[PDB]
Design a protein around this ligand. Structure first.
Ligand code: 4WI
Ligand code: 4WI
Lengths: 306, 306
C-alpha cells in the first residue's frame, strides 16, 4: 500500500515558532509556556562568530535588547539566561498554543521530523536521522537556526533537535533543547570535520521488512546465519554492529512478516556481497538506513496523532 | 546547504480534518466553513463496492445517517448532496479554523503534499507528484480515503487531491475537490490498469539545477543542443517532450546558476545515453523527477508560509 519518507504533522510545532532579533542578527525561536528557546549565537555580530565569547556578549545585553515577535505581536522579554549553547528568554505572555511537550536527547540511529523555518515562519517539513557521527543530512539556509527537530507520541511533542550550523560537507549540526551539541561540534565559525559515518544496520533491516510487507521479496534467500558471523561481514562494509537489543527491537516486524530476524540478516549479507545487480527495493537502488523499526510499524500499520 | 523531499507544513490543513461515519464505513472528511467533503463510497457497504449505484444508495440516506466527528465534538448534518465522486455534508457549525483556501485541479507533473489521515486524525505528511498517467506514488492503508493533497501560497491553501483508491501496482488514484477523478479511474472495486508512465523531463532538469546549486557538478558537459534534437533522444527513454513553456519556466534556475537551459539538456542527454557509471547526484543513483522548478526555488531560496 506504498512506502514513503514520512514526517510527523507539524501543526502543533508551528504554533510554537517565533522570530528572535538581537542587534541585526535574526533567527528562529521556540515559544513554550512563557519561555523562548533559541541558539545563543543570536547575540553575535558577523565578526564575533569566528571566535566568540558568549558570556561576555550576554553581560552587555538587557531584556529590551531582544526583539521577540509572534506573528505581528511583540513579546516583551522579562528575563534572560544561557544554558550551554541555548538561550532562554522569559516572556510576559504564556503561549496559549503550547502543546504537551517534553525535551529529549535522542541516540544516534533515531529519526525525527525537522520543521525548517525562516523569520519565525515555517517553510517546510522533512524527516531526518541522527547519523552515527552525530550529524544530520538536512536542508537549511541562512536564518534557519532555531528550527527544531521533533517526534510526536499521541498528544506529546518530544523536541530533540535545534539547528545551529552547517559543516564543510553539506551536513548539519545542532543541540538538544538543553543546549548540548550532538557530537563534538562547537558554535563557532572555524574548521570542523564530521568523523567517518557508519551505516545504521538495524534501520536497514527495518527497511527490508518494510519492503516485504509491500510485496518486494526478490532479495529473500532460504539461508540463516548467526549474529556473530553476520557482524563480521558487515564490519567490512562500514555497517554498525547489530546488538541483541536491535534483534529484540525488530521482533514486531519479525512476528508480522513471519521472517526470523537472522534470516533477514542472511538476506542482507548477500546484498552486501553481491550488490543488487541492477534491481531496486521500494524504488531505490541503494540500501536505505533512515527508517527506524518504529517508523516502519507506524507507517505500515497507520498510527495517528491526537 | 542540503536538498530534501520537503513537504508543506500541515497545521492549516490538520485543523480541517474530521471523521465521517455512515453505517459501518468510516473515512476522513475535510471541514471548510459549514461543509464537509468526503469520498462518496462512504455510503457503501463492502459488497456494494464491487459495482455500486451511488445515486440509489444516497436516496435511502437522511442527514442523521451521517456521523461527523470533529475531535470529540459531533457535527449535526443539515443537508447532503453528491458532486461527481465527492459528497458534501452541510453542517450547523462553521469550522473556526478554516484557512483561506481554494480548490484547484493540478496538471500532470505538478507536486503537492499529502496529509495521510486515519479516523480523522493525521498520521503523517509527505510530498507527491501527479504522474503523467494520472496516478501518485503515495502511502495509504484502509481508512485513509478523504486524506487530501495540497499546496500553500503564503496564506492560501490550494487543495488539489482527495484520496479514493489503490491500483494493482501499489500506486494511488483520486479526485480533485469537485469530485472528478484524475485519469480514467472510477470508484468501484474492479480491475483497473494505470497506463504506461513517462518521466517528467522538466522536473529532472529542475533537479539537476538543484544539484549544481548544491555543489554537485560532475555531470555538466561543455556542449549545447537544440530543443528538437534533445527531444528525439529523450523519446527513446520514455521521457516527456520538453515544450518551450518548460524552457521558460526553467528561466529563473537558468539565470541563477548561469547555465543556459539547453546546456543542461545537453548534460541530460549524456546521462540518458551513458548512464551515471556508478556516481550519485544529490545522494541518488537514479535521476529524480518529483521536484518542480517551483519546488527547487522555494527550497534553495527559503520561501515561507504565513
Ligand atoms: C543559522 N541560522 C545558520 C545556518 C547555516 C547557514 C548555512 N546553512 C546553515 O545550516 N548557522 C550559522 O551560520 C552558523 C553559526 C556561525 C557560522 N555557522 C555556520 O553554520 C558555518 N559553519 C561553520 O563555520 C563550520 F564549518 F564550522 F561548520 C557556515 C560557514 C556559515 C556554514 C555559527 C555561530 C557557528
Ligand atoms: C479508502 N479508504 C480506501 C483506501 C485504500 C485501501 C488500501 N489502500 C488504499 O489506498 N479505498 C478503497 O478501499 C477503494 C474503494 C473501494 C475499493 N478500493 C480500493 O482501493 C481497491 N482498489 C481497486 O479495486 C482497484 F484495483 F480498482 F484499484 C482495493 C482492492 C481495496 C485496493 C472503492 C470504492 C474503489
Amino acid at each position: 500500500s506504498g512506502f514513503r519518507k514520512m514526517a510527523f504533522p507539524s501543526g502543533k510545532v508551528e504554533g510554537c515558532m517565533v522570530q528572535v532579533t538581537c542587534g541585526t542578527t535574526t533567527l528562529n525561536g521556540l515559544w513554550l509556556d512563557d519561555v523562548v528557546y533559541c541558539p545563543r549565537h543570536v547575540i553575535c555580530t558577523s565578526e564575533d562568530m569566528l571566535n566568540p565569547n558568549y558570556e561576555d556578549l550576554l553581560i552587555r545585553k538587557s531584556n529590551h535588547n531582544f526583539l521577540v515577535q509572534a506573528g505581528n505581536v511583540q513579546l516583551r522579554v522579562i528575563g534572560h539566561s544561557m544554558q550551554n549553547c541555548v538561550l532562554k528568554l522569559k516572556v510576559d505572555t504564556a503561549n496559549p498554543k503550547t502543546p504537551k511537550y517534553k525535551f529529549v536527547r535522542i541516540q544516534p540511529g533515531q529519526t525525527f521530523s525537522v520543521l525548517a523555518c525562516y523569520n519565525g515562519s515555517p517553510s517546510g517539513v522533512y524527516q531526518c536521522a541522527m547519523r552515527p557521527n552525530f550529524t544530520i543530512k538536512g536542508s537549511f539556509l541562512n536564518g534557519s537556526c532555531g528550527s527544531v527537530g521533533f517526534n510526536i507520541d499521541y498528544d506529546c511533542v518530544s523536541f530533540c533537535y535545534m539547528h545551529h550550523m552547517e559543516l564543510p560537507t553539506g551536513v548539519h549540526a545542532g543541540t538538544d533543547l538543553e543546549g548540548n551539541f550532538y557530537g563534538p561540534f562547537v558554535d563557532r565559525q572555524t574548521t570542523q570535520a564530521a568523523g567517518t559515518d557508519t551505516t545504521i544496520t538495524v534501520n536497514v533491516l527495518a527497511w527490508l521488512y518494510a519492503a516485504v510487507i509491500n510485496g518486494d521479496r526478490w532479495f529473500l534467500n532460504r539461508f540463516t546465519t548467526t549474529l556473530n558471523d553476520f557482524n563480521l561481514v558487515a564490519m567490512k562494509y562500514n555497517y554498525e554492529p547489530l546488538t541483541q537489543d536491535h534483534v529484540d527491537i525488530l521482533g514486531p516486524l519479525s512476528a508480522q512478516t513471519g521472517i526470523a530476524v537472522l534470516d533477514m540478516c542472511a538476506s542482507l549479507k548477500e546484498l552486501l556481497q553481491n550488490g543488487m545487480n541492477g534491481r531496486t527495493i521500494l524504488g531505490s537502488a541503494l540500501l536505505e538506513d533512515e527508517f527506524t523499526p518504529f517508523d516502519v510499524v507506524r507507517q505500515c500499520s497507520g498510527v495517528t496523532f491526537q
